[PDB]
């Protein structure tokens, strides 16, 4: 019979009636499960041994995708779907969350012989990538409400990811002054939604699937790792004091995350070679956080 | 009438006591003398109190249970219950040929089995007379051949008339509900009635 | 917004007539809840064929007999007699599969519902598709 | 639930075989599933035991159908001890893995049938599987 | 028969063997422990022991069957001491390294039968398995 | 303890040879098995009855009650 | 529990007359817990023996001198004198138990009870079995 | 149901008399709690011997002197004089053990309590067993 290989698969995200086949996929992980109500009615009459278990709900699925950067920048739609406002090829973090509910979309995981798993009512809840000395890759995390098995599906023949972008060394700046001795710049963006369970007595003897959710908060964060370097005795630029507001940018040849004003906290580790670690979050009144997506030649 | 339970209705295993509280209720005129002596006078009648707690009840089981309870509330009769922990059939035989000599009052009782019963009722077991619906509790036992001497915690409510027959098995408490005035049942989204409990109380 | 399921795989039983009936129902999502009314199958005909392969030039194993059961309730039945079942059984692949030697692949099938009239547009519609399997029987 | 038509029969050597089918119609709309039995009118069962599924296979034996107590739905399928001997004669010499007494004797299936109860020959297969002979010691 | 209910009999050497059954049908749907002893009137069980599990095997012994209590449901399967001695003589000598008392003698089955006027053959197999001999020294 | 009980006669024999597992529904095999794990439990609980009569003494649990029994399997 | 129930081991102590006290009792558990009555052991004779090996040709190293101390109450006693113990110790294997060096293997044993009586119920049962071990001593 | 502890290892002190006393107590478990009454040691004698090895033909290092202290309280004392301690010390193994050069293995010992009379059965009973060690002393 037909076995199902992960390497022989195709992941298509269905949004607005168009299929976004996300090629250049390094690895994805997903699971499906059901919720049970298992009670044991041991009584003084009969100290029974057999439980009363009924399947009544579908446990929400947690799908994680690892997607390489591409020249056609389809992967920026994950920021677009997660709530960021768009102007050109740059994504803004809005001052306030636009809507109460996230942007919902369906997703297919295609396989050979018309086999498919249909995740519905999905939303992008996490996107983080590490700019480092290895090839950058953004791990997106989406949560589903209802999963199903379907025969025919949506396959993104045209909308697809192009060639992976060549590696380019990261560099973090303050205005235009470079920060020396970078190790690993990791950026994190989240849409911490929550499922609104509305399982009621009208759903008795039926399988319940989560359908609606609301956004608790959105945020942009970055953890920067440096080597503890000082150029002067009693230096003022490079030290361990906190910085309430400072313009920061984690720049690459193909992407640049901008914090117009940042709150930096420093942490020193007395390891083999001393390392300082930053904790960059935008300030209260900071302008929207920028995320530029340069395909080629900026 | 009979309170439904897995013995009467085995098709409903959800019925059946998750926990039963058999309380002792003997009102007494207790007085604490200034010299340290405590004097208590028994005047009001004693009555067993039964607190029954039910496990998760499915809709059909609760439908049967509350149908029976509402029939109780309608026809107004008494509601018999059978505690299963005291259902250890420790006395075989038929008790019709067992005579209890008349003119007996108080805790002690003397009954002649005439060589019919097999099995010894140990202390702590239940006891009930055929005519009166009161339920006693054996506290001590002593037999000399066929004659049995049984001591009961509550004094015999009625003096034996020479025809009352012992009932060592299938003893039912003639109780009355005490939660009737405000008795609500909650239905969960899981589909079960949770926290169903009864506060019964023996009448007479 | 959801997906359809046009691909359906049928399993027939050897030496037994096979009967499948389809109901077409009109649907809508509006302020009032989902209103469903059966589609009136007038001038609606069906036609299905089975071949051993998708590629052009495939041998026609058999063809399905089409009928309409109830126009008012929008029910149409697509089935084949027992002799057609035997014919398909003869032409099936001889390759068995372990854990269930009964099932054998018979070929691919399609069903088109059409409405042909002078005033009606020449419109066809492939309602389903898939593969046909056979559960071999020993009786008869 | 789903389908469970596939059940294997283990018939005993030197002993007549008889199976008792309590036909039933369970419906799970109400939580205590309805125990309504089907009513056996205009019903006939036919079953043959044939070695292998290939066409032209020789008929090892044939089941003998009995319809009794039509009101409550039960029915019986059986075959005489002579049929058992004929089955055991043609059984393969290779023994089953889990039981060293059973030997594969062939395949089978029984087919219910309505004969013009509503001018329809609504005949469909009930069950199926493999027939296993269990070697005896008494005779 | 009962393929899942195979039980190996153990017969002691130098000791007459005795095994008793109880045919006692149950119906616990009304209430648990509702069991009625089956009437065994005009029932006659019989069995045999053979060295190998195939045709042409040499018979080792035949159980001396009986019906201890008619209408009470207590049947008995047994064989005398001389038959046990014959079994011990015929039993194999491939003694186990950790059960040096038990040797395999053969395979056994017993069939219950109805011989009622106004009825037909009702043979049915109720026991199945192997016969193990336990060695003895006290004679 | 100094002397003990030693099971000279009651002992385990030879280990059974390996045989591949198989899971069925009635008599229809379930394809592509990997690992069938079965679990059975008797989830008892100790009844601690350490009282003031055991002061200046070492207490050892003696009695227990069965909360539940169950049979489970993960396929 | 095919044979696991009626098997126990005996360790006769060297230079001491070995005597085992048995108490038959008819325990009823299926009908109701905690109900037991003695077996009326009148006409229930006992006999046992010991042999070095389980082969057909084995040496009768000793034999229990069984006796029914109480006809009722189901009390019996199997015992062997000092000479039999000495014979067993002399005719025992020289290989010592590692977990208990004083014990060495002597042989196998069985016990049969024969309830011969006027009633035609002259049944026999093997109520005991196992291995016989000798525990060495120095007090002589 | 619990186990016994017949195996006891004794440690004697060189140049010092060794005294061990045993009390035999009747016990029972009934409705009333454990009732213990001392066993009356009448016609009860003890006898113990020590050899350097378990195997037959072992050299007898010494023998214990036996006495009964109190029959009513069921107390019997088993001991040896200082000269016997010296005798055993001379015959002990010369192999020392580090972390405690004092102790040396002396041999194995057994104790049998017996009751011999015309009306009494010829019954012996090995009450204990084990090994005898010596704590070498320098004084005397």
């Amino acid at each position: 019979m037909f076995y199902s290989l992960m390497r022989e698969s195709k992941i298509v995200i269905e949004y607005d009636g168009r299929g976004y086949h996300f090629d250049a996929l390094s690895n994805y992980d997903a699971s499906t499960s059901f919720q049970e109500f298992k009670t044991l009615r041991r009584t003084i009459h009969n100290r029974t041994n057999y439980a009363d278990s009924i399947i009544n709900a579908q446990d929400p699925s947690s799908i994680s995708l690892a997607i390489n950067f591409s020249t056609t920048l389809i992967e920026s739609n994950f920021f677009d779907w997660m709530g960021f406002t768009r102007e050109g090829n740059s994504l803004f973090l809005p001052r306030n969350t636009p809507n109460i509910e996230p942007i919902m979309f369906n997703m297919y995981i295609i396989n050979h012989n018309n086999s498919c798993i249909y995740f519905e009512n999905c939303y992008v809840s996490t996107v983080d990538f590490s700019l480092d000395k290895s090839i950058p890759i953004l791990n997106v995390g989406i949560e589903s409400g209802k999963f199903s098995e379907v025969s025919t599906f949506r396959d993104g023949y045209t909308i697809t990811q192009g060639e992976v972008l060549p590696y380019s060394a990261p560099a973090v700046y303050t205005n235009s002054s470079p920060l020396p001795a970078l190790i690993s710049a990791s950026m994190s963006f989240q849409q911490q939604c929550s499922w609104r369970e509305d399982r009621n007595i009208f759903d008795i003897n039926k399988i319940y699937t989560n359908k609606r959710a609301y956004v608790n908060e959105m945020n942009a964060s970055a953890t920067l790792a440096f080597y503890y370097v000082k150029r002067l005795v009693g230096d003022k630029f490079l030290n361990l004091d906190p910085e309430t507001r400072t313009p920061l940018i984690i720049k690459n040849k193909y992407v640049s995350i901008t914090f117009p004003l940042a709150r930096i906290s420093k942490r020193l580790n007395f390891s083999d070679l001393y390392q300082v670690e930053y904790d960059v979050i935008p300030t209260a009144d900071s302008d929207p956080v920028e995320i530029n997506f340069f395909g080629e030649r900026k | 009438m009979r309170l439904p339970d897995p013995y009467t209705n085995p098709e409903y295993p959800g019925l059946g006591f998750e926990s039963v509280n058999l309380v002792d209720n003997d009102p007494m005129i207790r007085d604490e003398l200034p010299n340290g002596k405590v004097k208590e006078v028994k005047i009001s009648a004693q009555y067993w109190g039964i607190n029954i707690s039910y496990p998760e009840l499915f809709p059909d089981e609760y439908a049967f249970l509350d149908s029976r309870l509402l029939e109780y509330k309608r026809t107004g009769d008494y509601l018999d219950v059978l505690l299963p922990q005291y259902e250890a059939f420790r006395v075989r035989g038929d008790t019709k040929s067992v005579t209890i000599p008349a003119g007996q009052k108080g805790s002690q009782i003397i009954l002649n089995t005439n060589g019919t019963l097999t099995g010894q009722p140990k202390a702590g077991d239940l006891f009930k007379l055929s005519t009166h619906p009161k339920v006693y509790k054996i506290t001590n036992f002593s037999s000399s051949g066929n004659v049995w001497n049984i001591s009961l915690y509550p004094d015999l409510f009625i003096t034996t008339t020479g025809s009352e027959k012992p009932v060592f098995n299938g003893i039912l408490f003639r109780t009355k509900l005490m939660n009737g005035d405000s008795f609500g049942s909650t239905l969960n989204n899981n589909g079960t009635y949770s926290g169903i409990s009864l506060s019964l109380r023996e009448s007479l | 917004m959801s997906t359809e399921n046009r691909v359906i795989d049928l399993v027939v039983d050897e030496n037994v007539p096979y009967g499948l009936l389809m109901q077409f129902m009109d649907v809508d999502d509006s302020v009032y809840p989902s209103t469903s009314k059966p589609v009136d199958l007038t001038d609606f005909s069906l036609r299905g064929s089975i071949k051993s392969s998708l590629e052009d030039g495939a041998e026609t194993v058999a063809s399905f007999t089409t009928a309409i059961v109830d126009a008012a309730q929008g029910v149409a039945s697509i089935s084949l007699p027992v002799s057609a079942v035997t014919t398909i059984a003869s032409k099936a692949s001889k390759e068995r599969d372990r854990y269930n030697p009964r099932q054998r692949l018979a070929g691919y099938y399609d069903v088109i519902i059409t409405r042909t009239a002078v005033g009606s547009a020449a419109s066809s519609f492939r309602i389903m598709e898939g593969k046909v399997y056979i559960s071999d029987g020993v009786t008869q």
Side-chain angles (χ1 to χ4, degrees), chain A, chain B, chain C:
Chain A
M1 72 291 291
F2 320 127
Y3 296 71
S4 302
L5 285 85
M6 201 185 78
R7 291 198 49 102
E8 303 172 342
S9 75
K10 146 162 72 166
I11 281 181
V12 178
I13 284 187
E14 163 187 35
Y15 175 71
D16 210 38
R18 310 182 305 273
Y20 293 79
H21 165 51
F22 272 96
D23 206 354
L25 181 69
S26 294
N27 174 57
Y28 75 95
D29 167 82
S31 288
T32 79
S33 55
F34 289 87
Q35 282 204 262
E36 70 163 359
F37 161 66
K38 176 212 73 193
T39 180
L40 187 67
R41 318 199 269 174
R42 285 175 78 90
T43 59
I44 310 181
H45 295 246
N46 313 323
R47 296 187 295 262
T48 197
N49 290 352
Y50 291 69
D52 290 290
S53 164
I54 62 170
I55 301 299
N56 46 4
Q58 288 192 355
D59 209 26
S61 311
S62 305
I63 299 94
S64 188
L65 320 182
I67 286 174
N68 291 254
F69 278 67
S70 82
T71 60
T72 174
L73 307 170
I74 305 285
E75 58 271 39
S76 73
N77 288 27
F78 280 121
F79 294 97
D80 186 23
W81 297 329
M82 182 179 72
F84 284 52
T85 61
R86 188 173 220 102
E87 288 157 60
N89 290 318
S90 60
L91 277 297
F92 296 78
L93 180 81
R95 303 290 331 247
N96 317 326
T97 301
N99 316 325
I100 307 170
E101 316 182 53
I103 304 190
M104 294 265 170
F105 58 85
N106 310 311
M107 182 179 72
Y108 304 79
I109 296 174
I110 321 292
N111 202 337
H112 297 201
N113 309 326
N114 289 272
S115 161
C116 177
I117 301 279
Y118 193 16
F119 295 103
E120 281 181 343
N121 304 311
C122 297
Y123 64 94
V124 182
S125 78
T126 316
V127 166
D128 54 59
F129 56 96
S130 186
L131 286 188
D132 189 358
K133 66 185 289 184
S134 51
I135 288 171
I137 181 167
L138 73 165
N139 308 55
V140 309
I142 63 170
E143 320 278 4
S144 167
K146 169 183 215 161
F147 60 94
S148 170
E149 308 191 325
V150 288
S151 302
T152 179
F153 38 79
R154 195 182 284 261
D155 44 0
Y157 291 122
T158 48
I159 302 173
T160 175
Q161 288 215 325
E163 293 179 353
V164 298
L165 296 164
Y167 171 75
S168 179
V172 55
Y173 289 92
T174 301
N175 279 340
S176 78
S177 82
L179 276 195
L182 183 62
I183 305 177
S184 85
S186 81
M187 274 63 55
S188 166
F189 312 87
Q190 280 155 321
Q191 197 203 32
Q192 269 156 51
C193 285
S194 177
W195 288 115
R196 181 191 74 88
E197 183 178 1
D198 56 357
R199 216 157 52 89
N200 48 68
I201 60 164
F202 294 74
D203 270 319
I204 295 177
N205 294 322
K206 266 192 282 304
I207 297 169
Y208 163 85
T209 69
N210 301 275
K211 208 163 299 282
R212 310 195 65 181
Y214 53 88
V215 190
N216 293 317
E217 68 184 2
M218 294 162 69
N219 49 6
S221 173
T223 286
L224 302 177
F226 295 80
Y227 284 112
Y228 189 49
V229 296
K230 291 177 71 68
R231 44 211 311 181
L232 312 173
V233 172
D235 187 0
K236 284 173 222 63
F237 182 62
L238 291 176
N239 45 7
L240 292 193
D241 290 272
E243 310 209 310
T244 61
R245 44 171 51 210
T246 181
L248 208 68
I249 184 168
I250 305 104
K251 197 193 307 182
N252 192 9
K253 188 172 302 181
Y254 306 109
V255 64
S256 70
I257 308 105
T258 300
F259 297 82
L261 291 167
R263 197 270 312 156
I264 298 188
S265 178
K266 290 144 194 196
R267 171 175 291 93
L268 182 50
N269 303 296
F270 290 66
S271 66
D272 205 343
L273 195 67
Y274 293 10
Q275 295 199 20
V276 76
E277 212 170 346
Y278 290 15
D279 295 87
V280 192
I281 73 162
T283 81
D285 56 350
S286 170
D287 293 313
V289 165
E290 213 64 26
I291 316 182
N292 287 254
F293 270 89
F294 311 112
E296 287 287 339
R297 297 291 185 268
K298 185 178 205 177
Chain B
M1 52 179 314
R2 182 51 173 292
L3 180 88
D5 43 8
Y7 296 162
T8 61
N9 301 105
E11 72 267 355
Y12 299 115
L15 305 169
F17 316 151
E18 174 194 330
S19 75
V20 62
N21 186 19
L22 185 67
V23 307
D24 188 359
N25 290 323
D26 52 340
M28 65 184 73
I29 305 191
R30 174 141 50 61
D31 186 74
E32 294 200 85
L33 300 179
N35 59 4
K37 304 178 179 56
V38 173
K39 306 307 179 60
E40 49 194 7
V41 175
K42 302 288 191 67
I43 284 179
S44 165
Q46 195 251 347
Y47 59 99
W48 302 104
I50 307 162
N51 294 323
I52 288 168
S53 192
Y54 274 91
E56 299 285 271
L57 295 173
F58 282 99
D60 193 298
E61 301 145 48
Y62 177 73
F64 193 76
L65 178 58
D66 73 347
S67 88
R68 294 321 300 281
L69 276 176
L70 291 191
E71 169 90 15
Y72 163 76
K73 286 189 179 178
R74 173 193 89 91
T75 182
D77 63 330
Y78 313 103
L79 180 135
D80 301 338
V81 301
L82 179 89
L83 307 196
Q85 69 258 32
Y86 295 121
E87 211 56 39
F89 291 89
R90 276 198 264 274
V91 171
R92 296 291 185 269
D94 199 46
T95 54
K96 315 305 186 258
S97 183
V98 183
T99 186
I100 300 191
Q104 285 178 355
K105 57 182 60 43
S107 58
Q108 303 260 42
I109 195 173
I110 297 179
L111 73 164
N112 193 357
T113 57
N114 299 315
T116 313
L117 267 48
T118 73
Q120 299 294 321
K122 44 194 58 187
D125 283 358
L126 288 180
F127 178 79
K128 174 181 177 165
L129 289 162
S130 56
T131 70
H132 212 265
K134 192 69 188 65
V135 174
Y136 307 100
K137 220 158 185 182
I138 303 170
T139 68
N140 188 18
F141 186 83
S142 184
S143 58
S144 168
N146 313 329
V147 63
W148 290 4
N149 196 309
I150 305 176
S151 58
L152 314 163
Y153 158 56
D155 280 311
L156 282 192
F157 262 60
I158 63 161
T159 73
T160 51
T161 63
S163 60
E164 278 89 44
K165 306 300 179 179
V167 179
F168 286 107
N169 289 318
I171 299 188
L172 314 165
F173 296 78
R174 218 193 71 207
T175 44
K176 295 271 281 186
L177 191 52
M178 301 295 258
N179 282 356
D181 294 8
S182 184
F183 185 87
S185 50
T186 315
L187 180 58
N188 302 142
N189 46 359
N190 295 308
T192 57
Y193 294 87
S194 184
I196 309 289
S197 52
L198 302 173
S199 302
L200 300 165
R201 187 265 192 190
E202 188 180 21
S203 167
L204 183 63
Chain C
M1 172 45 158
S2 171
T3 186
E4 61 196 340
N5 290 66
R6 304 261 170 250
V7 192
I8 301 299
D9 282 1
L10 314 166
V11 176
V12 303
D13 302 356
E14 194 186 13
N15 296 115
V16 162
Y18 178 78
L20 185 80
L21 60 91
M22 312 145 58
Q23 165 163 62
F24 310 90
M25 292 215 58
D26 188 336
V27 298
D28 186 34
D29 300 324
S30 182
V31 183
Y32 44 79
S34 65
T35 55
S36 313
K37 69 197 71 83
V39 162
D40 178 83
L41 282 72
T42 304
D43 191 23
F44 283 3
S45 69
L46 279 70
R47 60 181 177 90
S49 170
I50 305 166
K51 268 165 271 303
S52 43
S53 172
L54 281 192
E55 188 67 27
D56 53 355
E59 182 65 26
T60 301
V61 183
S63 296
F64 292 102
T65 180
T66 69
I68 311 102
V69 168
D70 193 287
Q73 304 285 58
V75 170
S77 65
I78 178 58
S79 61
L80 66 157
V82 59
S83 175
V85 182
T86 296
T87 317
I88 297 169
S90 53
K91 304 272 301 153
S93 292
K94 310 267 171 93
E95 181 56 340
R96 299 298 179 91
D97 174 65
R98 52 184 167 87
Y99 292 147
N100 186 29
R102 308 291 188 124
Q103 269 169 40
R104 301 182 303 158
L105 180 46
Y108 306 71
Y109 82 111
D110 291 331
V111 185
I112 293 175
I113 177 169
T114 190
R115 183 200 43 199
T116 299
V118 174
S120 175
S123 50
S124 292
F125 173 48
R126 199 161 71 179
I127 183 61
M128 294 182 286
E129 65 183 1
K131 309 207 235 181
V132 171
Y133 291 88
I134 297 169
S135 189
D136 291 331
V138 288
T139 313
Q140 290 90 353

